[PDB]
């Protein structure tokens, strides 16, 4: 559970990202595929990381991260009460694209850089640890609903 007090941090800053999806969400991946290669895998091949101009010119890549950051957001809006925003997300991610839960770390981790890299005057150590809180609420709760699908990822 996070307190109001972190809630509010969390989306303090995430109000910052909305002035801006499309270009938070391509540094967002960028920073993840760059980080972390093999995550390509989960989407064609192009399993091969292209340079960061072209990541950045990417239709593709843009609405990616839009996908991601509109979906994420609808839920730290919940303040933990996303039972019913999970629950879709959850399936695709468990039974159609397989996205294991060391994957979600890995994307929390690239979030919590950008957010660093682009609002640290919003970001400092309580607010960073409030969003590490409130994304690790997210990660035990998916994998809860992975398992109920059969998905031990
Ligand atoms: C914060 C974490 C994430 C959120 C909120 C999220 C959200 C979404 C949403 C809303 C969609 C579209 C609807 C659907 O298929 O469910 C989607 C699709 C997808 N996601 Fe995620 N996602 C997350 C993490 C990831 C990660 C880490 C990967 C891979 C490493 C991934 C792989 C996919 C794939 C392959 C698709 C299908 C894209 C396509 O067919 O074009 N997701 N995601
Ligand atoms: C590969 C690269 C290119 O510029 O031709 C390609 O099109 N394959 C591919 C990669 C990729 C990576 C991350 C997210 N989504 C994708 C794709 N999505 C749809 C079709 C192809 C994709
Ligand atoms: O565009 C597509 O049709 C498919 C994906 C893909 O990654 N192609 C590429 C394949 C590679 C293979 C070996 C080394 N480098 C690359 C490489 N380097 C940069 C950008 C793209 C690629």
Redesign the pocket.
Same mark, same amino acid.
């Given at each position: 559970v996070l307190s109001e007090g972190e809630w509010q941090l969390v989306l303090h800053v995430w109000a910052k990202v909305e002035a801006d999806v499309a270009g938070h969400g391509q540094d967002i991946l960028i920073r @993840?595929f760059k980080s972390h290669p093999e #995550?390509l895998e +989960? *989407?064609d091949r192009c399993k091969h990381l292209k340079t960061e101009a072209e990541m950045k010119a990417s239709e593709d890549l843009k609405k %990616?991260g839009v #996908?991601?950051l #509109?979906?994420?957001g609808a !839920?730290l809006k919940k303040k933990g009460h996303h039972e019913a925003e999970l629950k879709? @997300?959850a399936q695709? %991610?468990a039974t +159609? %694209?397989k !996205?294991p839960i060391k994957? @979600?770390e *890995? !994307?929390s981790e690239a979030i919590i850089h950008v957010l660093h890299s682009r609002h640290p005057g919003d970001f400092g150590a309580d607010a960073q640890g409030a969003m590490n809180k409130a994304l690790e609420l997210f990660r035990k709760d998916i994998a809860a609903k992975y398992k109920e699908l059969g998905y031990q990822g």
């Amino acid at each position: 559970v996070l307190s109001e007090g972190e809630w509010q941090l969390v989306l303090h800053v995430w109000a910052k990202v909305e002035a801006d999806v499309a270009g938070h969400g391509q540094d967002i991946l960028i920073r @993840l595929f760059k980080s972390h290669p093999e #995550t390509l895998e +989960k *989407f064609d091949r192009c399993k091969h990381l292209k340079t960061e101009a072209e990541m950045k010119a990417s239709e593709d890549l843009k609405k %990616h991260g839009v #996908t991601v950051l #509109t979906a994420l957001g609808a !839920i730290l809006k919940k303040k933990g009460h996303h039972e019913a925003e999970l629950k879709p @997300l959850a399936q695709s %991610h468990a039974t +159609k %694209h397989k !996205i294991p839960i060391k994957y @979600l770390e *890995f !994307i929390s981790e690239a979030i919590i850089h950008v957010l660093h890299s682009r609002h640290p005057g919003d970001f400092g150590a309580d607010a960073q640890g409030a969003m590490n809180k409130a994304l690790e609420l997210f990660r035990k709760d998916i994998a809860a609903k992975y398992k109920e699908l059969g998905y031990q990822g």
